[PDB]
């Protein structure tokens, strides 16, 4: 049972991490998609 | 001579106002640009 608990506690943290990386890795993609929003900022100053 | 004058300032008052016009014209050609890109930049905030 020690191993029991032990084994539950290394899952549950196994998830944990991979929940991590998954955040940081769309919060990649959100900021990709950011920078084109402010390319099309600043090329609308340039038109105005 | 007058008369004729007469004719030509009214010819000259014209032309300013026409172009007047002509440069609204070319203004709101770039302003219809600049939306364009600023409905661009909205585009890429649905896609965001």
């Known amino acids: ?48 | 001579i007058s008369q004729s004058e007469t004719y030509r300032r009214r010819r000259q008052e014209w032309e300013i106002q026409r172009n007047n016009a002509e440069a609204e014209l070319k203004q709101i050609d770039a302003q219809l640009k600049s939306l364009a890109v600023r409905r661009e930049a909205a585009v890429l905030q649905k896609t965001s």
Request: charge should be negative; avoid cysteine; charged fraction near 25%.
């Open chain 1, 1 to 48: 049972t020690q191993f029991g608990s032990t084994l539950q506690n290394i899952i549950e943290r196994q998830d944990a991490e991979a929940l991590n990386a998954l955040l940081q890795n769309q919060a990649a993609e959100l900021i990709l998609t950011n920078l084109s929003i402010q390319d099309k900022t600043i090329e609308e100053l340039d038109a105005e």
